[PDB]
Symmetry: C3
Subunit: 334 residues, 3 copies
């Protein structure tokens, strides 16, 4: 059958990304991944609101999988008996059978092994899609992540120059729909099944209660701020499986941006704000020039500041007064 070398990957939780090569001299391999589904009640904000989450590998988003063009991605999807619902997986990077969804439906207690050839480069969403109304419900419950398919020569700028990142982060954005009771408090539920009727009613009204990165308000702040140093080129992969987003690095730019997320297209340069279409992943790289704190947001600022969609970067290095300076500090008007 398929006679290529096998390579296992140990996935790591977002926003971090498992170790990988950008450019590689390896030829095609069968790259082996395991995703174990976990349904669990989680806390999504600083007020203690709870949420019936459904996850790949315990996280929102599911972890970033990284391969190269022409690799074969062999995923063991596991649905333990401790879960209540069937689940599957649709890879937007894959060709056929509803992205794999038609070949991966598993009941609690089952697993399945799907292989797909990575013929399309870029960052792509993966998500659960059991069928019918279950599709949006599983997705907005957290069951989505992304996979990055790099060219074997690494990234380029479309003008012949290599673009090498010093680090990569994966920001998965999640629209969440938590119903409220009559007096206006968020509801808690004993199971995903019990949450479904109220949650679907809200979903159909198309206004989320929360829009978060990495599964919670504030997830990518404080101890868990993203980091960089002045001089480092950082790739930020952003996904949104269900709803549009408009990423922006406050105090920075997107030096090279693939907003549609596909490396067969040259990046755009020098963006302020870019656009992640719901159902996609995109990527932006930026070389930090200034130390200090940055915020990384969706630039619907209501969503960013009030519904949860803000991350921070803490950046080390030397301030550049040529690029920016406070000529006169705040003072009384003359």
């Amino acid at each position: 059958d398929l006679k290529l070398p096998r390579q296992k990957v140990e996935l790591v939780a977002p926003p971090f990304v498992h170790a990988h090569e950008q450019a590689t001299k390896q030829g095609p391999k069968i790259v082996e991944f395991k995703l174990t589904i976990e349904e669990k009640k989680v806390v999504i904000d600083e007020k203690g609101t709870t949420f019936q989450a459904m996850t790949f590998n315990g996280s929102m988003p599911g972890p970033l999988m990284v391969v190269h063009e022409g690799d074969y991605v062999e995923t063991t999807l596991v649905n333990p008996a401790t879960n209540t619902m069937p689940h599957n997986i649709d890879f937007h990077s894959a060709t056929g059978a509803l992205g794999g969804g038609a070949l991966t439906l598993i009941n609690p207690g089952e697993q399945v092994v799907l292989r797909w050839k990575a013929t399309k480069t870029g960052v792509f969403v993966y998500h659960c899609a059991p069928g019918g109304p279950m599709i949006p419900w599983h997705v907005v419950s957290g069951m989505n992540g992304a996979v990055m398919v790099l060219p074997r020569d690494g990234l380029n700028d479309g003008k012949g120059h290599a673009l090498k990142y010093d680090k990569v982060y994966y920001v998965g954005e999640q629209d969440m729909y938590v119903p409220r009771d009559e007096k206006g408090n968020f509801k808690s539920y004993d199971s995903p099944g019990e949450a479904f009727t109220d949650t679907e009613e809200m979903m159909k009204k198309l206004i989320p209660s929360h829009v978060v990165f990495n599964g919670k308000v504030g997830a990518l702040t404080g101890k868990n701020a993203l980091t960089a140093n002045v001089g480092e080129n950082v790739l930020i992969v952003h996904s949104q499986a269900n709803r549009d987003s408009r990423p922006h690095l406050i105090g920075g730019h997107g030096d090279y941006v693939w907003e549609t997320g596909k490396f067969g297209n040259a990046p755009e340069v020098g963006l302020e704000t870019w656009f992640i279409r719901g159902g996609s992943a995109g990527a932006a790289m930026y070389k930090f020039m200034q130390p200090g704190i940055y915020a990384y947001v969706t630039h619907n600022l209501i969503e960013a500041a009030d519904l949860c969609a803000t991350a921070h970067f803490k950046v080390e290095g030397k301030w550049n007064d040529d690029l920016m300076t406070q000529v006169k500090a705040p003072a009384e008007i003359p």
Copy 2:
């Protein structure tokens, strides 16, 4: 006056497209079309919800008109006396007089003949726009379609290679605003006029009750699924006259995509999901690689699965195990 050959087109209902050439050796012609407006009460979902529709040629969307750059498009717009409202037409492909709207206002019982030169290539919306608050109301009642203006040399990839499609489909997406009564059932009305006050109130809240393709939930499924064979290159024109959409072919890609819809720009390649700005048409071509059923959706999955915005393709041919295979069918976890 204008001394060119005249060619009549027999329009066909969406999602099909009237016969045309891609590349042509014909020079400019006056291409003659007729659109007859029909106001009618229709059923829009499988529950039997009704809707006061306003249409060009009896369909939602109106039919796709196809011409070549430099042709003159001569449209006889007819508003029969059996209708209740005035109507007109604005072609986004046309130059001057509000796209034609300022030259085509016709009362019931009248017709008008407008000619415009097709100086801009791409796919474009056309829609009714009588004036003032009537503009959105006529559009979201169904009065919109599209027109495709092909280069005379056919389509290309921006790198010198021809792109020829084997077939083309037109998917018109419609945001609909059907009010509900106090207990939560959709309302029915005796005329568009009677539907207006409740419908406008809802419209201004910017949340549709239904988002459909080809005028109804399920229109492009079952007997009426789109079709292809493995090896066929299919062009999918997508329009949305009032509201954004994010098309996605589940199990496929956009091999070549003009998301802004204009053929003077090279297509993007290898997309997962693309973006149709409200007030526009875009186009994507894909060469099918795998047989089976595909879904074509807007990738707000709530809209797709719960509000109506899903089409199917049924594709014939041989499965390609190199691209995808089920290595191990669902089984008990060891």
Copy 3:
């Protein structure tokens, strides 16, 4: 310290733009601007609805600032003692300190002077961002504008040809959130502070009551319509600091469009409708071909016609019957 020539600019209120060069033989300068914040109650519609606005220089949007790549932009931001709140400024064109926001927080009675180097070309949002939930509130209260950073050689089409505009207009789009009382009338408030709790509650629901250009329904109509002549190339800069928009010139096109707004990228050509991601500015140029009235809208037509987002152009010149003609005026159907 920084030993370059200083040049003062006298800002002008939108939609007009202060005098500037496109291509220039000047080298880098320190270009001096002053922005004075004004909190004020204004009328936003033809019904007399009032609104607690917060502005740079008294206008919504704040005025367009125009410089060239490599200039240094030195802004004196003034917060008079007659205001009630602290304020600051974040330039999306700037690098470091949250775009300047971390260096410009001023209480009523204070001013501050910030300099930033214009290292990124394009049109960019600037906006207030005091911190936390105040960020969206100040922005949607009106505290946003834009800055254009031109290449020193002026604009080009990406194919070696200069693009010179005959005039430029700045259309700032504002999503506004005015609460209603129980019977359904818009509320009035005595201060921004008093408006905050009801306004934030509404904001978080993500549906504006009004979407306007230049601060009011109808602002860019009648006496204050935009103007052009047949043959003139007009640049239209469009910004939206918080929420997406989809500009469209009814009866025209975007001949050259930078929808992401950044001049290091070639423009797209021949668009019908383009997309301004919330948190950005973009630009479109069009050479008028036909006289008469045009509407310039967001092509969510509900927003355009019903919530306020329509401007007009009045264009002088000779009608071109080759491009469009009414072959037969409205007449009884035979």
